[PDB]
Amino acid sequence: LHALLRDIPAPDAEAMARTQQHIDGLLKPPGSLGRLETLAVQLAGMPGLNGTPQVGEKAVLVMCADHGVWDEGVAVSPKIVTAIQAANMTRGTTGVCVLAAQAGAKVHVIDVGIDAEPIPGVVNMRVARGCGNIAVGPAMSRLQAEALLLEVSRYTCDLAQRGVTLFGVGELGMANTTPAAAMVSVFTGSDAKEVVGIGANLPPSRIDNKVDVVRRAIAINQPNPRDGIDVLSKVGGFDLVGMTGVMLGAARCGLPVLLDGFLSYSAALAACQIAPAVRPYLIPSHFSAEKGARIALAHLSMEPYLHMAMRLGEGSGAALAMPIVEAACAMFHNMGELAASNIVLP
Amino acid sequence: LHALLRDIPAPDAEAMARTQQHIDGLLKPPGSLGRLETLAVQLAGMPGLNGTPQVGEKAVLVMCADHGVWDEGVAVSPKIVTAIQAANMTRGTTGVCVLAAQAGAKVHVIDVGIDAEPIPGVVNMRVARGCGNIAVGPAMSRLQAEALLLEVSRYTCDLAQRGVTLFGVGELGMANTTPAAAMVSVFTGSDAKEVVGIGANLPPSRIDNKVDVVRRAIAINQPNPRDGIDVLSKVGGFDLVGMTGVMLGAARCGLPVLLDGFLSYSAALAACQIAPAVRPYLIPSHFSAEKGARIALAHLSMEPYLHMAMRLGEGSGAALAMPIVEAACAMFHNMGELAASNIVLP
C-alpha cells in the first residue's frame, strides 16, 4: 500500500505545454472555450492518456454498503433499499444505469459491505454485513480500511489494462450522508450544523438528531484529521473507503476520475489527505444539492461544471459529465487552425 | 407576422401533470434528480413533442452577419473573419461544428447579412452587405426587421416538418457584442458600463470606447424598450434579428430552443418582449463569460446548467447542452419504478 502511494505519477508538464500551444492555435479567439480548454490540458498531462486528451472506454464504479448508524434514525429510506437497488443496478433500471448508457459507459456494481445475502451479478468485495455504528464506535478497523483500499485500487487499475481510460465513482448505502458529513466536518474543521443536509428527503424536524449523531461520532472516535485512513476507518464506511480506493487506483494508473456528489467529495478529501498526488487526477462533475457541498468543494478547490440540483448519488452526476470530457477531446482533435484560414489575431 | 405571434401555443398543462406523476414514481427519492426532472416536465408541456419528453433530430441554426459599428474600433477581429468562418462552417472545422457532431446535431449556416460575396453552401437570406452602424443611426428599417423575422421563423418551423424536435441558436458576426450590449442595456435599464464586456479579447484599454459607442447608439436612436422590434431594428443587427426569429419560429411550432451565450440572451430578451408566449419554449445552456451575462440572465429569470466560462459563440454552448436534454428524456423513459421493486418511501 505504501508502494501504491509511492508510485503515483506526477502530471506530464511537457505534454501539457504541447497541448496548450495546440489549443491556442485552433479556429477561435484564444481562451474563448474557457474550461473546455483547461480540461483538455489537464487530461493531456495524465500519463495513462498517452500525451493527448483522449477517451477510450468509460466505466462507473458503484460502491455499495450498509451502515450501523442507520439505527440512529438518521435516514427515512428503509435499510433494505441498498440491497434492492444493488440488484436493480444489475438490470440497468437505475438512474446511474440509464445515464451511463446514454454516455456509453459501463456500470460496475461492487458490494463492499451490504447487509444482506450476496447478490448475484454484483462484484463481491464485502468486508462485512454493514459497518459499525459510528455513533458509538468506529466504522471498522484500520486494517480493514487498508485492505479494502488495496483491493479496490487494484481492481481499478486492472480495468485500465482492458481499455478503460475514464472512471466515474458512485455509491449506494442508506444513511451514508451521515458518515459523509462527519468526514467533511473533520477534514474542513467545519461545525456539524454547517455540513449536515437532508440527504434522501430527511424531514426537517429530524435534522437536529442527525447533527447530534455526527457530533457524537466525532467526540467518541476522536478521528485524526491529518490521518485520512484514520478518519475513514473511524467515521467513514465501506462505501466511502471503496470510493477513495477508486481514486487512488486511477491516480496510480495515471488516469482521470470524475467525482459525483457530496458522498464523493467526502471520499476525495480523504484521498487527497492520504496522497496529495491524487488531486490532479480528479475532475468534478456537478454541484450537489446537499447542504455541505459548498464547503467540501471549497476545500478541494474545485468548481463543478454542472448545476443541476441533483442529489441522487449512485454516480449519476459522474455519468452525466462524461460527454463533457469527450467534448474537450473532440475540440482538441477535430477543430481546424487559424493559420490554415490565414486568420491573424493580435 | 401578427398571425404568427397570435398562434403561439400555450404549454400543455395536462401533459405536464402526467409527466410529473410519472417522474415521481421512478426508482429514486422524489425530486432527487432536481433540474433534470423539471426539464423533463418542461419538455412534456411543449405541443410539438407529442405529450412526452422526447428528442428526434437536432439542429443548430447559425445566423451570420456583419455590422457597420465595426468601424468604431469596438472589435480586434478583422471584419473578414465573418465570411471566413461562415465558409469554415461548411467544412465542419469550427467549434460549433465539432460540438454539434459530438451531439449528433446538424449545423445550418444562414447568411443574413455578411459583407462579402455569397458563400456557396450557405443558406442565403441576406438582407444587406452588413447592417448600418448603430453609432450614428439605425441598424436597419423596421420593415427589414419584420421581413427577416418572418422568413427565419418560417424556415425554422419548416425544419420541424422534417423531424427536427430540438433547436439550438447561434451567431457569427465580428463586433456583435456591441449591439448585444446596447440591447441588454435598453431592455434591462442597466447602465452601459455594467453590460459591456471584452467580447473577443478586446484589450482592456479599448473598453472605454466600446462603452461610449453603446451610449451614443442609444442616445441617437432612442429605441423604445417596450417595443422589441423597435429595439432590434435600431440598435440590433441582422444576426440578432435572425436569432430572435428562430425563437419565434420554434415557439410557434411548439418546440424547444436551446440558448447559447450573451448574444443569444440579447435575442431572447427581444423575443420575450415581442411575445411573452415564447418564454416557456426557451432552455438555457451555459453561463457565458461575458460581463453582462448575469444581468441578462436575471431578466430572463434563467439559470444555466453549464458553467464553462465559454465565450466563443456560434451556438457552441447550445450544442454542448444537447446531451443534457437527451438525458432528461432517457431518465423519463428508461428508469424503473419504485412500486415494481416494492419500494415504499414515506
PDB file of N, CA, C and O in Angstrom, chain B residues 23-69:
ATOM      1  N   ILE B  23     -42.611  10.812 -13.177  1.00  0.00           N
ATOM      2  CA  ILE B  23     -41.296  11.077 -12.652  1.00  0.00           C
ATOM      3  C   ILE B  23     -41.253  10.790 -11.161  1.00  0.00           C
ATOM      4  O   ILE B  23     -40.297  10.232 -10.627  1.00  0.00           O
ATOM      5  N   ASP B  24     -42.297  11.194 -10.473  1.00  0.00           N
ATOM      6  CA  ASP B  24     -42.317  10.971  -9.044  1.00  0.00           C
ATOM      7  C   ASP B  24     -42.259   9.502  -8.690  1.00  0.00           C
ATOM      8  O   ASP B  24     -41.764   9.162  -7.628  1.00  0.00           O
ATOM      9  N   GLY B  25     -42.763   8.639  -9.572  1.00  0.00           N
ATOM     10  CA  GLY B  25     -42.783   7.204  -9.310  1.00  0.00           C
ATOM     11  C   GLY B  25     -41.522   6.460  -9.732  1.00  0.00           C
ATOM     12  O   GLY B  25     -41.426   5.238  -9.601  1.00  0.00           O
ATOM     13  N   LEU B  26     -40.530   7.166 -10.248  1.00  0.00           N
ATOM     14  CA  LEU B  26     -39.340   6.453 -10.668  1.00  0.00           C
ATOM     15  C   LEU B  26     -38.480   5.977  -9.491  1.00  0.00           C
ATOM     16  O   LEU B  26     -38.652   6.433  -8.371  1.00  0.00           O
ATOM     17  N   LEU B  27     -37.572   5.039  -9.780  1.00  0.00           N
ATOM     18  CA  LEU B  27     -36.641   4.415  -8.835  1.00  0.00           C
ATOM     19  C   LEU B  27     -35.615   5.407  -8.222  1.00  0.00           C
ATOM     20  O   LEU B  27     -34.406   5.361  -8.507  1.00  0.00           O
ATOM     21  N   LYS B  28     -36.089   6.316  -7.370  1.00  0.00           N
ATOM     22  CA  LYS B  28     -35.233   7.323  -6.720  1.00  0.00           C
ATOM     23  C   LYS B  28     -36.064   8.086  -5.721  1.00  0.00           C
ATOM     24  O   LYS B  28     -37.296   8.047  -5.773  1.00  0.00           O
ATOM     25  N   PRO B  29     -35.381   8.800  -4.841  1.00  0.00           N
ATOM     26  CA  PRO B  29     -36.084   9.624  -3.881  1.00  0.00           C
ATOM     27  C   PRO B  29     -36.702  10.763  -4.668  1.00  0.00           C
ATOM     28  O   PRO B  29     -36.055  11.323  -5.547  1.00  0.00           O
ATOM     29  N   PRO B  30     -37.966  11.050  -4.395  1.00  0.00           N
ATOM     30  CA  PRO B  30     -38.661  12.101  -5.100  1.00  0.00           C
ATOM     31  C   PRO B  30     -37.888  13.404  -5.069  1.00  0.00           C
ATOM     32  O   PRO B  30     -37.356  13.806  -4.023  1.00  0.00           O
ATOM     33  N   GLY B  31     -37.814  14.003  -6.270  1.00  0.00           N
ATOM     34  CA  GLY B  31     -37.143  15.270  -6.530  1.00  0.00           C
ATOM     35  C   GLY B  31     -35.626  15.194  -6.538  1.00  0.00           C
ATOM     36  O   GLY B  31     -34.968  16.209  -6.777  1.00  0.00           O
ATOM     37  N   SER B  32     -35.077  13.992  -6.269  1.00  0.00           N
ATOM     38  CA  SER B  32     -33.633  13.808  -6.189  1.00  0.00           C
ATOM     39  C   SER B  32     -32.857  14.089  -7.452  1.00  0.00           C
ATOM     40  O   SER B  32     -31.660  14.301  -7.377  1.00  0.00           O
ATOM     41  N   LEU B  33     -33.505  14.085  -8.615  1.00  0.00           N
ATOM     42  CA  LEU B  33     -32.790  14.345  -9.863  1.00  0.00           C
ATOM     43  C   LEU B  33     -32.890  15.811 -10.309  1.00  0.00           C
ATOM     44  O   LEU B  33     -32.524  16.177 -11.424  1.00  0.00           O
ATOM     45  N   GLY B  34     -33.393  16.617  -9.391  1.00  0.00           N
ATOM     46  CA  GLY B  34     -33.555  18.062  -9.490  1.00  0.00           C
ATOM     47  C   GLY B  34     -33.978  18.660 -10.825  1.00  0.00           C
ATOM     48  O   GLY B  34     -35.103  18.460 -11.278  1.00  0.00           O
ATOM     49  N   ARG B  35     -33.076  19.468 -11.402  1.00  0.00           N
ATOM     50  CA  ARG B  35     -33.307  20.159 -12.660  1.00  0.00           C
ATOM     51  C   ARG B  35     -33.553  19.251 -13.854  1.00  0.00           C
ATOM     52  O   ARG B  35     -34.155  19.626 -14.869  1.00  0.00           O
ATOM     53  N   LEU B  36     -33.062  18.036 -13.734  1.00  0.00           N
ATOM     54  CA  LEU B  36     -33.270  17.034 -14.762  1.00  0.00           C
ATOM     55  C   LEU B  36     -34.762  16.709 -14.788  1.00  0.00           C
ATOM     56  O   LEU B  36     -35.331  16.480 -15.838  1.00  0.00           O
ATOM     57  N   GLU B  37     -35.415  16.750 -13.621  1.00  0.00           N
ATOM     58  CA  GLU B  37     -36.851  16.467 -13.549  1.00  0.00           C
ATOM     59  C   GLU B  37     -37.685  17.609 -14.075  1.00  0.00           C
ATOM     60  O   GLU B  37     -38.650  17.403 -14.802  1.00  0.00           O
ATOM     61  N   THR B  38     -37.302  18.827 -13.711  1.00  0.00           N
ATOM     62  CA  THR B  38     -38.017  19.999 -14.144  1.00  0.00           C
ATOM     63  C   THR B  38     -37.868  20.210 -15.644  1.00  0.00           C
ATOM     64  O   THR B  38     -38.788  20.605 -16.349  1.00  0.00           O
ATOM     65  N   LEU B  39     -36.702  19.869 -16.161  1.00  0.00           N
ATOM     66  CA  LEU B  39     -36.513  19.991 -17.579  1.00  0.00           C
ATOM     67  C   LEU B  39     -37.458  19.046 -18.320  1.00  0.00           C
ATOM     68  O   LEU B  39     -38.145  19.424 -19.273  1.00  0.00           O
ATOM     69  N   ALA B  40     -37.518  17.800 -17.845  1.00  0.00           N
ATOM     70  CA  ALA B  40     -38.393  16.816 -18.450  1.00  0.00           C
ATOM     71  C   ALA B  40     -39.861  17.259 -18.433  1.00  0.00           C
ATOM     72  O   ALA B  40     -40.614  17.045 -19.387  1.00  0.00           O
ATOM     73  N   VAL B  41     -40.273  17.871 -17.335  1.00  0.00           N
ATOM     74  CA  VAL B  41     -41.652  18.301 -17.250  1.00  0.00           C
ATOM     75  C   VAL B  41     -41.870  19.437 -18.215  1.00  0.00           C
ATOM     76  O   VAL B  41     -42.919  19.562 -18.855  1.00  0.00           O
ATOM     77  N   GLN B  42     -40.834  20.248 -18.349  1.00  0.00           N
ATOM     78  CA  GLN B  42     -40.939  21.367 -19.249  1.00  0.00           C
ATOM     79  C   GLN B  42     -41.136  20.914 -20.688  1.00  0.00           C
ATOM     80  O   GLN B  42     -41.984  21.428 -21.423  1.00  0.00           O
ATOM     81  N   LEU B  43     -40.355  19.931 -21.093  1.00  0.00           N
ATOM     82  CA  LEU B  43     -40.464  19.420 -22.455  1.00  0.00           C
ATOM     83  C   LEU B  43     -41.830  18.784 -22.725  1.00  0.00           C
ATOM     84  O   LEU B  43     -42.398  18.876 -23.824  1.00  0.00           O
ATOM     85  N   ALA B  44     -42.345  18.095 -21.717  1.00  0.00           N
ATOM     86  CA  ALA B  44     -43.627  17.419 -21.838  1.00  0.00           C
ATOM     87  C   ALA B  44     -44.765  18.376 -22.193  1.00  0.00           C
ATOM     88  O   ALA B  44     -45.776  18.027 -22.841  1.00  0.00           O
ATOM     89  N   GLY B  45     -44.614  19.604 -21.737  1.00  0.00           N
ATOM     90  CA  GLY B  45     -45.660  20.564 -21.988  1.00  0.00           C
ATOM     91  C   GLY B  45     -45.611  21.183 -23.370  1.00  0.00           C
ATOM     92  O   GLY B  45     -46.544  21.911 -23.720  1.00  0.00           O
ATOM     93  N   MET B  46     -44.528  20.936 -24.132  1.00  0.00           N
ATOM     94  CA  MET B  46     -44.361  21.510 -25.482  1.00  0.00           C
ATOM     95  C   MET B  46     -45.138  20.732 -26.536  1.00  0.00           C
ATOM     96  O   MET B  46     -44.808  19.590 -26.828  1.00  0.00           O
ATOM     97  N   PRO B  47     -46.172  21.370 -27.087  1.00  0.00           N
ATOM     98  CA  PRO B  47     -47.061  20.730 -28.034  1.00  0.00           C
ATOM     99  C   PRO B  47     -46.467  19.953 -29.199  1.00  0.00           C
ATOM    100  O   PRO B  47     -46.958  18.861 -29.567  1.00  0.00           O
ATOM    101  N   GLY B  48     -45.381  20.469 -29.750  1.00  0.00           N
ATOM    102  CA  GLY B  48     -44.738  19.772 -30.858  1.00  0.00           C
ATOM    103  C   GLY B  48     -44.024  18.467 -30.462  1.00  0.00           C
ATOM    104  O   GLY B  48     -43.531  17.755 -31.328  1.00  0.00           O
ATOM    105  N   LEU B  49     -43.982  18.164 -29.163  1.00  0.00           N
ATOM    106  CA  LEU B  49     -43.318  16.984 -28.611  1.00  0.00           C
ATOM    107  C   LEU B  49     -44.285  15.853 -28.348  1.00  0.00           C
ATOM    108  O   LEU B  49     -43.935  14.791 -27.846  1.00  0.00           O
ATOM    109  N   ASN B  50     -45.536  16.053 -28.662  1.00  0.00           N
ATOM    110  CA  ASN B  50     -46.405  14.911 -28.503  1.00  0.00           C
ATOM    111  C   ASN B  50     -46.630  14.322 -27.092  1.00  0.00           C
ATOM    112  O   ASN B  50     -46.771  13.112 -26.888  1.00  0.00           O
ATOM    113  N   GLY B  51     -46.723  15.206 -26.112  1.00  0.00           N
ATOM    114  CA  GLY B  51     -47.063  14.874 -24.737  1.00  0.00           C
ATOM    115  C   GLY B  51     -46.047  14.138 -23.907  1.00  0.00           C
ATOM    116  O   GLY B  51     -46.353  13.683 -22.807  1.00  0.00           O
ATOM    117  N   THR B  52     -44.823  14.058 -24.385  1.00  0.00           N
ATOM    118  CA  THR B  52     -43.839  13.355 -23.603  1.00  0.00           C
ATOM    119  C   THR B  52     -42.484  13.964 -23.886  1.00  0.00           C
ATOM    120  O   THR B  52     -42.339  14.611 -24.913  1.00  0.00           O
ATOM    121  N   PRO B  53     -41.506  13.807 -22.983  1.00  0.00           N
ATOM    122  CA  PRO B  53     -40.191  14.357 -23.253  1.00  0.00           C
ATOM    123  C   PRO B  53     -39.496  13.468 -24.271  1.00  0.00           C
ATOM    124  O   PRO B  53     -39.284  12.290 -24.021  1.00  0.00           O
ATOM    125  N   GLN B  54     -39.163  14.039 -25.425  1.00  0.00           N
ATOM    126  CA  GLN B  54     -38.505  13.305 -26.488  1.00  0.00           C
ATOM    127  C   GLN B  54     -37.677  14.225 -27.349  1.00  0.00           C
ATOM    128  O   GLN B  54     -37.933  15.418 -27.438  1.00  0.00           O
ATOM    129  N   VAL B  55     -36.672  13.627 -27.980  1.00  0.00           N
ATOM    130  CA  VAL B  55     -35.764  14.331 -28.861  1.00  0.00           C
ATOM    131  C   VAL B  55     -35.609  13.512 -30.116  1.00  0.00           C
ATOM    132  O   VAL B  55     -35.189  12.359 -30.031  1.00  0.00           O
ATOM    133  N   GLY B  56     -35.963  14.093 -31.258  1.00  0.00           N
ATOM    134  CA  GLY B  56     -35.833  13.416 -32.539  1.00  0.00           C
ATOM    135  C   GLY B  56     -34.545  13.902 -33.152  1.00  0.00           C
ATOM    136  O   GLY B  56     -33.472  13.627 -32.603  1.00  0.00           O
ATOM    137  N   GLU B  57     -34.653  14.661 -34.239  1.00  0.00           N
ATOM    138  CA  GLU B  57     -33.458  15.234 -34.844  1.00  0.00           C
ATOM    139  C   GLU B  57     -33.175  16.551 -34.158  1.00  0.00           C
ATOM    140  O   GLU B  57     -34.086  17.164 -33.612  1.00  0.00           O
ATOM    141  N   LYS B  58     -31.912  16.951 -34.212  1.00  0.00           N
ATOM    142  CA  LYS B  58     -31.417  18.190 -33.627  1.00  0.00           C
ATOM    143  C   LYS B  58     -30.740  19.070 -34.668  1.00  0.00           C
ATOM    144  O   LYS B  58     -30.035  18.606 -35.571  1.00  0.00           O
ATOM    145  N   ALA B  59     -30.922  20.370 -34.531  1.00  0.00           N
ATOM    146  CA  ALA B  59     -30.286  21.288 -35.461  1.00  0.00           C
ATOM    147  C   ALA B  59     -29.802  22.533 -34.749  1.00  0.00           C
ATOM    148  O   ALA B  59     -30.404  23.008 -33.788  1.00  0.00           O
ATOM    149  N   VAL B  60     -28.700  23.062 -35.237  1.00  0.00           N
ATOM    150  CA  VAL B  60     -28.163  24.285 -34.714  1.00  0.00           C
ATOM    151  C   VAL B  60     -28.177  25.278 -35.856  1.00  0.00           C
ATOM    152  O   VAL B  60     -27.517  25.045 -36.872  1.00  0.00           O
ATOM    153  N   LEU B  61     -28.928  26.363 -35.691  1.00  0.00           N
ATOM    154  CA  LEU B  61     -29.007  27.434 -36.692  1.00  0.00           C
ATOM    155  C   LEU B  61     -28.051  28.565 -36.328  1.00  0.00           C
ATOM    156  O   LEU B  61     -28.185  29.191 -35.264  1.00  0.00           O
ATOM    157  N   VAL B  62     -27.095  28.826 -37.228  1.00  0.00           N
ATOM    158  CA  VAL B  62     -26.101  29.863 -37.041  1.00  0.00           C
ATOM    159  C   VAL B  62     -26.356  31.016 -38.000  1.00  0.00           C
ATOM    160  O   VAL B  62     -26.235  30.849 -39.226  1.00  0.00           O
ATOM    161  N   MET B  63     -26.707  32.173 -37.413  1.00  0.00           N
ATOM    162  CA  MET B  63     -27.019  33.407 -38.131  1.00  0.00           C
ATOM    163  C   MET B  63     -25.780  34.261 -38.292  1.00  0.00           C
ATOM    164  O   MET B  63     -25.155  34.671 -37.314  1.00  0.00           O
ATOM    165  N   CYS B  64     -25.401  34.521 -39.530  1.00  0.00           N
ATOM    166  CA  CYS B  64     -24.180  35.245 -39.794  1.00  0.00           C
ATOM    167  C   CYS B  64     -24.421  36.593 -40.421  1.00  0.00           C
ATOM    168  O   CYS B  64     -25.215  36.727 -41.344  1.00  0.00           O
ATOM    169  N   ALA B  65     -23.710  37.598 -39.935  1.00  0.00           N
ATOM    170  CA  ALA B  65     -23.879  38.932 -40.477  1.00  0.00           C
ATOM    171  C   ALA B  65     -22.817  39.878 -39.994  1.00  0.00           C
ATOM    172  O   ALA B  65     -22.227  39.664 -38.946  1.00  0.00           O
ATOM    173  N   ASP B  66     -22.563  40.918 -40.805  1.00  0.00           N
ATOM    174  CA  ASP B  66     -21.583  41.950 -40.479  1.00  0.00           C
ATOM    175  C   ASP B  66     -22.262  43.199 -39.926  1.00  0.00           C
ATOM    176  O   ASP B  66     -23.463  43.411 -40.120  1.00  0.00           O
ATOM    177  N   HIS B  67     -21.494  44.024 -39.232  1.00  0.00           N
ATOM    178  CA  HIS B  67     -22.047  45.197 -38.587  1.00  0.00           C
ATOM    179  C   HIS B  67     -21.256  46.467 -38.892  1.00  0.00           C
ATOM    180  O   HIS B  67     -20.023  46.483 -38.814  1.00  0.00           O
ATOM    181  N   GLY B  68     -21.978  47.553 -39.197  1.00  0.00           N
ATOM    182  CA  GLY B  68     -21.345  48.830 -39.501  1.00  0.00           C
ATOM    183  C   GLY B  68     -20.536  49.368 -38.324  1.00  0.00           C
ATOM    184  O   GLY B  68     -19.515  50.017 -38.507  1.00  0.00           O
ATOM    185  N   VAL B  69     -21.007  49.080 -37.112  1.00  0.00           N
ATOM    186  CA  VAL B  69     -20.341  49.533 -35.899  1.00  0.00           C
ATOM    187  C   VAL B  69     -18.906  49.019 -35.774  1.00  0.00           C
ATOM    188  O   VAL B  69     -18.102  49.470 -34.947  1.00  0.00           O
TER     189      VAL B  69
END
